[PDB]
mmCIF file of N, CA and C in Angstrom:
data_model
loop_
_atom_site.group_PDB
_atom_site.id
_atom_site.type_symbol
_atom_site.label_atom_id
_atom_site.label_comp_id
_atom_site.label_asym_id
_atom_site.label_seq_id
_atom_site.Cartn_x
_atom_site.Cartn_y
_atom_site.Cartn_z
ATOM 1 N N UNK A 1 -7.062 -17.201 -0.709
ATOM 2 C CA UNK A 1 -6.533 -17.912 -1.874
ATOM 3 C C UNK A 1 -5.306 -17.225 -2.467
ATOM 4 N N UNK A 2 -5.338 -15.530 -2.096
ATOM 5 C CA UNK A 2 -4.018 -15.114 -2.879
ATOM 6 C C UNK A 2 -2.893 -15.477 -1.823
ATOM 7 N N UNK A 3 -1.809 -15.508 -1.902
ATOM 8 C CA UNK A 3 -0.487 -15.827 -1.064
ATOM 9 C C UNK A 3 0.451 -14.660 -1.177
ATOM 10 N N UNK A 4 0.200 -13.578 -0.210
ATOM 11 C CA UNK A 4 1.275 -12.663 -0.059
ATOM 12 C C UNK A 4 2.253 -12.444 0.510
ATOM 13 N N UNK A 5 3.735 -12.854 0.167
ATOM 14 C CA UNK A 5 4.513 -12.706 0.953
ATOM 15 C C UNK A 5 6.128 -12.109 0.501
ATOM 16 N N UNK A 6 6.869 -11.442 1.663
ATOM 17 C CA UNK A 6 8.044 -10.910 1.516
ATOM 18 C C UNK A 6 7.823 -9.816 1.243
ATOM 19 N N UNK A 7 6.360 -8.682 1.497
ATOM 20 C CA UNK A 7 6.175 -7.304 1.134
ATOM 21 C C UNK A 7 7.112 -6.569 2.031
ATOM 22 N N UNK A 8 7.596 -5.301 1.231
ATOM 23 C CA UNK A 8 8.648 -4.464 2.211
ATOM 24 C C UNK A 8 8.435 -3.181 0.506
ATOM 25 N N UNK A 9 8.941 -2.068 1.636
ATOM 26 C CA UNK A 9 9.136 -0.764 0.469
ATOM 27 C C UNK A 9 11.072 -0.943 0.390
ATOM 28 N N UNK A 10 11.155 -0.732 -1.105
ATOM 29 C CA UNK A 10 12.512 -0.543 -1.219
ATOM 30 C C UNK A 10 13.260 0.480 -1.893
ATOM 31 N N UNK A 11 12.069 1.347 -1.936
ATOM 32 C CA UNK A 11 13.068 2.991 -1.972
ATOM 33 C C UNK A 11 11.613 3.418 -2.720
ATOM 34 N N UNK A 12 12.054 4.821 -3.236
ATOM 35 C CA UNK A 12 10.876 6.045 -3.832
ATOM 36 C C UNK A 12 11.198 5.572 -5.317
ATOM 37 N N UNK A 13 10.486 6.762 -5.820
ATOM 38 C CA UNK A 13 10.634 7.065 -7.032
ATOM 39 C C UNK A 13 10.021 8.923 -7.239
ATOM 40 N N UNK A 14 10.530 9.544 -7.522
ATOM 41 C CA UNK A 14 10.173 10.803 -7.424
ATOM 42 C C UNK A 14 9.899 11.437 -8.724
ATOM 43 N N UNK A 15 8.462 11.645 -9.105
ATOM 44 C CA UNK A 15 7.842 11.849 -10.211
ATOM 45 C C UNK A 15 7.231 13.572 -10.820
ATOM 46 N N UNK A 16 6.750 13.308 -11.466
ATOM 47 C CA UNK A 16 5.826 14.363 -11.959
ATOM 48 C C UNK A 16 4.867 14.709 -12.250
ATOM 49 N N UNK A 17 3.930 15.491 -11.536
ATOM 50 C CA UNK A 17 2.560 15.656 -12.589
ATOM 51 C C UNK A 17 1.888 17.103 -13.321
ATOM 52 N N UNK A 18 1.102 17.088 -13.771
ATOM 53 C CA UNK A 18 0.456 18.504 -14.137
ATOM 54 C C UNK A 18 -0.449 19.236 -13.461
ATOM 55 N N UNK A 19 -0.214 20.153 -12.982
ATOM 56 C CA UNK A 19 -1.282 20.503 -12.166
ATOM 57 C C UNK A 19 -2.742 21.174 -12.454
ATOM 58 N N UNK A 20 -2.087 21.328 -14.532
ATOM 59 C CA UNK A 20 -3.275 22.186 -15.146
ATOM 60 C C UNK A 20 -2.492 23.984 -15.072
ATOM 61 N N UNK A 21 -1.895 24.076 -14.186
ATOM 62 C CA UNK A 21 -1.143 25.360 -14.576
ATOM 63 C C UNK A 21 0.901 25.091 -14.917
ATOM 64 N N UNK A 22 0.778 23.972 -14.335
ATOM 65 C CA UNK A 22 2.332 23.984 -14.372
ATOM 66 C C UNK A 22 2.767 22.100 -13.827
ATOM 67 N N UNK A 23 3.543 21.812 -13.297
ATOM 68 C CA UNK A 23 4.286 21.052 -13.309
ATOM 69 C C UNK A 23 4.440 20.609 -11.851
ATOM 70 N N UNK A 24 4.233 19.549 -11.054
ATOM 71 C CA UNK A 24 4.989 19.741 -9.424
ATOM 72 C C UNK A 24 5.200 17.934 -9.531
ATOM 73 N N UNK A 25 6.618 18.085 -8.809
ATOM 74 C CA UNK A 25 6.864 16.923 -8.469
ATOM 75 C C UNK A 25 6.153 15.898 -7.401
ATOM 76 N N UNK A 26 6.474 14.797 -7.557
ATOM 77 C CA UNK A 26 5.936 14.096 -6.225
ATOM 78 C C UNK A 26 6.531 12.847 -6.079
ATOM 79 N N UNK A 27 5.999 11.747 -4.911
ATOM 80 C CA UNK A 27 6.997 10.971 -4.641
ATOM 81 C C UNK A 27 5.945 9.619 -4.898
ATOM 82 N N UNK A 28 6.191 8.533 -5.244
ATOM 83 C CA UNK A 28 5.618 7.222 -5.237
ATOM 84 C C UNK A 28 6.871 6.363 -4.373
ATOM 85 N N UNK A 29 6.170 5.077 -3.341
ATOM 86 C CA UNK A 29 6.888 4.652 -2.551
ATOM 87 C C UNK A 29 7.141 3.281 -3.756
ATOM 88 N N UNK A 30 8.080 2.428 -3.360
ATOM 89 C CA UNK A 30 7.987 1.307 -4.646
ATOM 90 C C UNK A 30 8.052 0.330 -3.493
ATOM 91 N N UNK A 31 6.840 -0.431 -3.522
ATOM 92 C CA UNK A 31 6.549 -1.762 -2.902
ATOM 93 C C UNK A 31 6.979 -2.914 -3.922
ATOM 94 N N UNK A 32 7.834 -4.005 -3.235
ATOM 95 C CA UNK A 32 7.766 -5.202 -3.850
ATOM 96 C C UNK A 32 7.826 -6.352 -2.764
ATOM 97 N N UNK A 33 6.984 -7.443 -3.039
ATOM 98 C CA UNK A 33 6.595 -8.355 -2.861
ATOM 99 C C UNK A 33 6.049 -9.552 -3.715
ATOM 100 N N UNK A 34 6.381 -10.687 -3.183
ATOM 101 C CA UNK A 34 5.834 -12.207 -3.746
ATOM 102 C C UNK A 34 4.453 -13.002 -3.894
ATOM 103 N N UNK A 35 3.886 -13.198 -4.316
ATOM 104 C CA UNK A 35 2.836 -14.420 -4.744
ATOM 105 C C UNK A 35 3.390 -15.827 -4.587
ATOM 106 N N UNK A 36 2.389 -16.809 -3.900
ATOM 107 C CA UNK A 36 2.910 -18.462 -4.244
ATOM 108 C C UNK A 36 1.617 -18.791 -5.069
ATOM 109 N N UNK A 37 2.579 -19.745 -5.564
ATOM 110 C CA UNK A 37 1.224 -20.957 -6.212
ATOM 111 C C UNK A 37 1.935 -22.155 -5.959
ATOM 112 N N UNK A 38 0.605 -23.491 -5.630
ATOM 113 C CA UNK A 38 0.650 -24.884 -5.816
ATOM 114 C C UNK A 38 0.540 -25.231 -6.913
ATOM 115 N N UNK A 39 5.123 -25.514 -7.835
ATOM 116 C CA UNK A 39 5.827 -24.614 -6.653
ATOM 117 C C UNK A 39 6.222 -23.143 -7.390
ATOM 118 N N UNK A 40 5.192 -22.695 -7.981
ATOM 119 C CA UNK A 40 5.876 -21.547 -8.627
ATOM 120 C C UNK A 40 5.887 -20.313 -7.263
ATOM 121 N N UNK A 41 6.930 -18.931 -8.299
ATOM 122 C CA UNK A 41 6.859 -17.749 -7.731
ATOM 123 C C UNK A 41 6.410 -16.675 -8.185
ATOM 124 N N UNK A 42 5.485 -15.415 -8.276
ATOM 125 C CA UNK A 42 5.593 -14.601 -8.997
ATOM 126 C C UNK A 42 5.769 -12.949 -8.252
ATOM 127 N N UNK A 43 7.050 -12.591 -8.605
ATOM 128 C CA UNK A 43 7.723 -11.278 -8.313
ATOM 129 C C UNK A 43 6.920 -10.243 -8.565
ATOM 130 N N UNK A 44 6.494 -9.359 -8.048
ATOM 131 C CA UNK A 44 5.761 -7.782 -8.207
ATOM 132 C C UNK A 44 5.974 -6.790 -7.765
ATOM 133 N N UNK A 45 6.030 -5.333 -8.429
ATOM 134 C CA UNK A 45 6.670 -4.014 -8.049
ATOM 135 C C UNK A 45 5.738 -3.246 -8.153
ATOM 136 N N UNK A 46 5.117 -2.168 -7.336
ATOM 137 C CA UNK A 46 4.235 -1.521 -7.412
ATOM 138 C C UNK A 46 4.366 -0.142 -6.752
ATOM 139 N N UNK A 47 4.509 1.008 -7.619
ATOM 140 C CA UNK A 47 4.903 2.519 -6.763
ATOM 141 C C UNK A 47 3.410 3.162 -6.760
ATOM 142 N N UNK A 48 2.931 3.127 -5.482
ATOM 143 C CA UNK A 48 1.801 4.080 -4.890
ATOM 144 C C UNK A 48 2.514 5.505 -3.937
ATOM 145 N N UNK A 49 1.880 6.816 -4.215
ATOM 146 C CA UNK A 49 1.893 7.452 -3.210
ATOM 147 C C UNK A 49 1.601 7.577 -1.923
ATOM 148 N N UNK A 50 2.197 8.702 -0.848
ATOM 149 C CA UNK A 50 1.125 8.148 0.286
ATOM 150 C C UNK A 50 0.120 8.885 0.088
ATOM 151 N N UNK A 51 -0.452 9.262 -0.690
ATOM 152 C CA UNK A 51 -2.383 9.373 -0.284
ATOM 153 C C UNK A 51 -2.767 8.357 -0.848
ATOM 154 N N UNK A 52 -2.094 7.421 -1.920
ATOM 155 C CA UNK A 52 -2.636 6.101 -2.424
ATOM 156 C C UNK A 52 -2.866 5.523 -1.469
ATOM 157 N N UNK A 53 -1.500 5.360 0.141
ATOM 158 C CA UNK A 53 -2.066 4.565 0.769
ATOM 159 C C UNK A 53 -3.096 5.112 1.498
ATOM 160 N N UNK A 54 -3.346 6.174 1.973
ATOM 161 C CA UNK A 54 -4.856 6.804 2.575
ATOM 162 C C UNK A 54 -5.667 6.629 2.118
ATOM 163 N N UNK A 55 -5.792 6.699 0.755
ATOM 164 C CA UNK A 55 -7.124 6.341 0.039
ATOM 165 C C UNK A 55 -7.103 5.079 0.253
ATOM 166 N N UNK A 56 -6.441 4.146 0.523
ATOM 167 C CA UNK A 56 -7.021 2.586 0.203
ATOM 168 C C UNK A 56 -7.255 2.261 1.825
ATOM 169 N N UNK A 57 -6.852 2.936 2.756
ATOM 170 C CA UNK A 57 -7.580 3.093 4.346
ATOM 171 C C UNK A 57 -8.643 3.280 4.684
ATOM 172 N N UNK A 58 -9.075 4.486 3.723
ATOM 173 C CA UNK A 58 -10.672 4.985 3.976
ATOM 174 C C UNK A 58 -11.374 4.337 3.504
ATOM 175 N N UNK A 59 -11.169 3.283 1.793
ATOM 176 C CA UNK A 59 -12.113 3.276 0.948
ATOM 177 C C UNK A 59 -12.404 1.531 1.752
ATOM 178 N N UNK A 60 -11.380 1.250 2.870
ATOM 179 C CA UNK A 60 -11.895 -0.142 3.758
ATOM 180 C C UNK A 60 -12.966 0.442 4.631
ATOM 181 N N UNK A 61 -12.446 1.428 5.160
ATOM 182 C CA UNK A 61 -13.145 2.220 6.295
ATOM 183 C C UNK A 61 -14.723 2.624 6.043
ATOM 184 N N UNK A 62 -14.740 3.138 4.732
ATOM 185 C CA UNK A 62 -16.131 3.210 4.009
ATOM 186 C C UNK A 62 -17.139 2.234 4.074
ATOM 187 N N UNK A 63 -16.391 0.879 4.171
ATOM 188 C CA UNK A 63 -17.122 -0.542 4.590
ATOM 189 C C UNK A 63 -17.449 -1.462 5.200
ATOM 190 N N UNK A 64 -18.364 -0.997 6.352
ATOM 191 C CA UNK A 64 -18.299 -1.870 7.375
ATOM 192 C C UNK A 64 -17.980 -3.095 7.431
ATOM 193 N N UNK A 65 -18.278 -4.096 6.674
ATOM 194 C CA UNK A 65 -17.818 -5.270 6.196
ATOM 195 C C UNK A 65 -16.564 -5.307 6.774
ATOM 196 N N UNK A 66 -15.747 -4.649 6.033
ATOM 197 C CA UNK A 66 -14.252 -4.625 5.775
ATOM 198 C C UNK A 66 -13.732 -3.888 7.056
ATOM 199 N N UNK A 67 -14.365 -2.838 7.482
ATOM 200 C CA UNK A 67 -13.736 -1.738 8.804
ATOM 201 C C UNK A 67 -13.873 -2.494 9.565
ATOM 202 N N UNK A 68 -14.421 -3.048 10.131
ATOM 203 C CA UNK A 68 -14.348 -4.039 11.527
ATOM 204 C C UNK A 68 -13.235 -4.805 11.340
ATOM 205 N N UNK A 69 -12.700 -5.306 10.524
ATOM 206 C CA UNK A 69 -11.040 -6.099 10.683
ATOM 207 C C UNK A 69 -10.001 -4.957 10.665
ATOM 208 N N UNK A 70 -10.083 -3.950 10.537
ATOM 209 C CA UNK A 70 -8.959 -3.045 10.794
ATOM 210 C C UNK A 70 -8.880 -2.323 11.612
ATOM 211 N N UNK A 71 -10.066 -2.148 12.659
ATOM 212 C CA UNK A 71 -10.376 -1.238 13.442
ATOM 213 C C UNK A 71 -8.334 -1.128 14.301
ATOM 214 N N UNK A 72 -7.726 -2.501 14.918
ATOM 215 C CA UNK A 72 -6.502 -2.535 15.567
ATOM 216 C C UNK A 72 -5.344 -2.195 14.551
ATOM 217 N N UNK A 73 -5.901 -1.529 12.946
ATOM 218 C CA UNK A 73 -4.069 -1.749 12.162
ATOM 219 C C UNK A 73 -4.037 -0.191 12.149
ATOM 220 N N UNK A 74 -2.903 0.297 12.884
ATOM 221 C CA UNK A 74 -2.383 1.474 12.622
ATOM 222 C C UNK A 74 -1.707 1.785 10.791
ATOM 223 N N UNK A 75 -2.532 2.499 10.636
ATOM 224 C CA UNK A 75 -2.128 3.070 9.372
ATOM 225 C C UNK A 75 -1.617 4.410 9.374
ATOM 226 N N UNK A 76 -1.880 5.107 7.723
ATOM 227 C CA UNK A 76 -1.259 6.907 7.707
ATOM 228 C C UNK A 76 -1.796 7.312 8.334
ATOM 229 N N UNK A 77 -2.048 8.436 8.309
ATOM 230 C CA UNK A 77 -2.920 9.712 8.739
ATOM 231 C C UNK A 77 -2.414 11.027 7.846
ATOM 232 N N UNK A 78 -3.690 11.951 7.361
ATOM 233 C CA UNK A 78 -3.576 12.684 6.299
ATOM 234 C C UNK A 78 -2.330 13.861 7.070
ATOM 235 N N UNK A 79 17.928 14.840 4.602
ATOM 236 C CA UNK A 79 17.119 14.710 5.149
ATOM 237 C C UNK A 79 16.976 14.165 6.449
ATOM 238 N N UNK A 80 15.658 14.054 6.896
ATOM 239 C CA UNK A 80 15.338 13.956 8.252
ATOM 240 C C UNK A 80 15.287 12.358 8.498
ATOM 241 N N UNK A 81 16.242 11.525 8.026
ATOM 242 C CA UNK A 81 16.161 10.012 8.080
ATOM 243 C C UNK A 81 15.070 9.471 8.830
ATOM 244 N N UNK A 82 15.167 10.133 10.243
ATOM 245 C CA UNK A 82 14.494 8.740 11.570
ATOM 246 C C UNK A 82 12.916 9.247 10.962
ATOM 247 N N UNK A 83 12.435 10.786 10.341
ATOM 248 C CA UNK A 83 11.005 10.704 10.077
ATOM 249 C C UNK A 83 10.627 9.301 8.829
ATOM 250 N N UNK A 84 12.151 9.508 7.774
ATOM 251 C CA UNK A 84 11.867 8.930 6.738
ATOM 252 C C UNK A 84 12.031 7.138 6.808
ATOM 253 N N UNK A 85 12.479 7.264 7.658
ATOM 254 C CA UNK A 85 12.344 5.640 8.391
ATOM 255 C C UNK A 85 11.025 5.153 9.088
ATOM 256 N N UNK A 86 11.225 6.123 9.631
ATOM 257 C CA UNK A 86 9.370 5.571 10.607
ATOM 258 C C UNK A 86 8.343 5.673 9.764
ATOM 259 N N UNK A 87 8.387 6.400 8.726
ATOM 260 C CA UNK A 87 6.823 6.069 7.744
ATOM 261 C C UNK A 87 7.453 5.273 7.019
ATOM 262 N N UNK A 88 8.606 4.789 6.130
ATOM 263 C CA UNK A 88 8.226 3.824 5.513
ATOM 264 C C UNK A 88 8.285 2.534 6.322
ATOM 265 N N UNK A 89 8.629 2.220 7.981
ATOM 266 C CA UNK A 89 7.907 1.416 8.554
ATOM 267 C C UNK A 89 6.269 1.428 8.809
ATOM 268 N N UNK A 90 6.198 2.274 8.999
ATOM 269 C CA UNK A 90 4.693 2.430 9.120
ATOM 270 C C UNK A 90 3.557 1.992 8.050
ATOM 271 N N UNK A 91 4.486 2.859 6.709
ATOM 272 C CA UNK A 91 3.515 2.140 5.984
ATOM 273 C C UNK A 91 3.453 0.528 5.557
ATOM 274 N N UNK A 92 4.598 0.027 5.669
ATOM 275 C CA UNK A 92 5.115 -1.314 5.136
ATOM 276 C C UNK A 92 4.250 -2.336 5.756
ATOM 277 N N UNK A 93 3.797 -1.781 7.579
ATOM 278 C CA UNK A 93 3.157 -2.822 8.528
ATOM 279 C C UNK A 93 1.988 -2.691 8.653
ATOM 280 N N UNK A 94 1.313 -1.518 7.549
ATOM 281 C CA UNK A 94 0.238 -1.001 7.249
ATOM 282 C C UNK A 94 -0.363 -2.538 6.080
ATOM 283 N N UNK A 95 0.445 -2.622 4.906
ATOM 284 C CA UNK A 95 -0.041 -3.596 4.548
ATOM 285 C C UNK A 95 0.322 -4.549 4.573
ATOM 286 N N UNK A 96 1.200 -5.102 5.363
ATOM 287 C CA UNK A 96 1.390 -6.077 5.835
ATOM 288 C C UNK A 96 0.157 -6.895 6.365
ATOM 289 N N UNK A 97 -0.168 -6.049 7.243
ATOM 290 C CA UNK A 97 -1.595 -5.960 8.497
ATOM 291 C C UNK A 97 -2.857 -6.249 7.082
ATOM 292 N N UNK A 98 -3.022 -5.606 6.340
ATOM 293 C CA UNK A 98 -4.155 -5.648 5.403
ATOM 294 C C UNK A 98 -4.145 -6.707 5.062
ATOM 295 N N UNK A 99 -2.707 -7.601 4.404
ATOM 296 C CA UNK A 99 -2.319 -9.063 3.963
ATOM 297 C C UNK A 99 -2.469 -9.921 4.473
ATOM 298 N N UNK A 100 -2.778 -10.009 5.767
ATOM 299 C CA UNK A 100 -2.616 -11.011 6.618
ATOM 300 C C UNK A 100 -3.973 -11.238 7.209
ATOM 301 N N UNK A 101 -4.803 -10.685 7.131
ATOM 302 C CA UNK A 101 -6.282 -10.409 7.207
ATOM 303 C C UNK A 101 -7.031 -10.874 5.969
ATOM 304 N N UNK A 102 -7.381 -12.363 5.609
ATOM 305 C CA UNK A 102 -8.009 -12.817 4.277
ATOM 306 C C UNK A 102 -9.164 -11.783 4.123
ATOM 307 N N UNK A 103 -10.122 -11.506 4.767
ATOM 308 C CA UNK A 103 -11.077 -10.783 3.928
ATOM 309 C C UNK A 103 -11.010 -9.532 3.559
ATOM 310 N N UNK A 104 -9.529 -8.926 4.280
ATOM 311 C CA UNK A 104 -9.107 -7.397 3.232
ATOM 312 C C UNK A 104 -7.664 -7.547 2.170
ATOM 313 N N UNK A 105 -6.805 -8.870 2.580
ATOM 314 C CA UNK A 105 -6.061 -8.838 2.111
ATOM 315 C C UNK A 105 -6.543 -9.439 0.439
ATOM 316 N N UNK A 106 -8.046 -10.019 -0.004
ATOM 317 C CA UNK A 106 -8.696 -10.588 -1.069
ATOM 318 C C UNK A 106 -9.488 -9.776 -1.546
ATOM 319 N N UNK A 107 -9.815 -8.213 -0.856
ATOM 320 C CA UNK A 107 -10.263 -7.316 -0.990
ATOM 321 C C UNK A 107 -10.301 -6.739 -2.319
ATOM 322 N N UNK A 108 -11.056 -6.408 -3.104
ATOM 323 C CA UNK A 108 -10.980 -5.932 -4.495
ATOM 324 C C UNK A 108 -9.961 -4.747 -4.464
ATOM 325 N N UNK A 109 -10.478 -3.434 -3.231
ATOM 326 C CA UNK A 109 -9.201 -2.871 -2.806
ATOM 327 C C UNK A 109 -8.220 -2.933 -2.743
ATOM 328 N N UNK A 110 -7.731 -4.279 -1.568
ATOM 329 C CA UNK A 110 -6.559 -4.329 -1.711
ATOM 330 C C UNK A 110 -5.388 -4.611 -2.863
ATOM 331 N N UNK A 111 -6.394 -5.631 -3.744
ATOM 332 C CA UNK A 111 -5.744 -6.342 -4.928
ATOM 333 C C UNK A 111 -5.335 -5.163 -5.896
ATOM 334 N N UNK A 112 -6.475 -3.870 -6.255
ATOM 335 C CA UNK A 112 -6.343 -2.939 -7.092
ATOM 336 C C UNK A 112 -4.948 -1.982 -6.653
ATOM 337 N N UNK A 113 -4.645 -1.792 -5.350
ATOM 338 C CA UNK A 113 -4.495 -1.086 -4.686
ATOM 339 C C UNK A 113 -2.219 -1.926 -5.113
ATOM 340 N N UNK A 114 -2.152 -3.194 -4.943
ATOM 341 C CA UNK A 114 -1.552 -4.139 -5.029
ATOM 342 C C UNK A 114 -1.410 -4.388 -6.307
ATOM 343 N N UNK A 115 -1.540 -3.602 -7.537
ATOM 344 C CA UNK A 115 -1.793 -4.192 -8.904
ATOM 345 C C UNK A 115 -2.193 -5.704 -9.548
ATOM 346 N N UNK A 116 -2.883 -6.654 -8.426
ATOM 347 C CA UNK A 116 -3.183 -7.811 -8.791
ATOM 348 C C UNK A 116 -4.088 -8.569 -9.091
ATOM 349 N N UNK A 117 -5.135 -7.606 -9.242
ATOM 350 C CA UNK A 117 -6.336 -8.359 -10.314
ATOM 351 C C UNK A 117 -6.288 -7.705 -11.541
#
């Protein structure tokens, strides 16, 4: 029922957190992609890290339900352009693959994961 389309990463965002002793930077990828409805559109931006996307790999993987449709989608695994090109292909066809799969792409996961419930 949800309609995902035109997902792609279109650059970082390079952040900050606390570590409890001090300060360390880090990176969030910024996903954007479309919603349809029966003719509207609705636009969405969403910066996850990559262990965000690992965590939302395992926490399918955790569920048989859900792990049996992904068993074939290459996902993560826990400058230098061509590295920084090939993961953000990688990850992009990562959920692509999740989207295109109704019973993970409707996934409470995925949606949380997607800021869309």
């Amino acid at each position: 029922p949800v309609v995902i389309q035109n997902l792609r990463i279109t650059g970082t965002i390079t952040a900050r957190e606390h570590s409890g002793t001090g300060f360390h930077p880090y990176t969030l990828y910024t996903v954007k992609y479309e919603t349809v409805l029966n003719q509207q559109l609705a636009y969405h931006t969403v910066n996850r890290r990559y262990r965000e996307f690992l965590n939302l790999q395992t926490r399918l993987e955790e569920k048989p339900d859900l792990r049996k449709f992904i068993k074939n989608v290459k996902g993560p695994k826990k400058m230098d352009s061509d590295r920084v090109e090939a993961r953000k292909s990688l990850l992009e066809s990562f959920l692509k693959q999740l989207c295109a799969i109704p019973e993970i792409g409707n996934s409470e996961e995925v949606q949380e994961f997607l800021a869309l419930n």
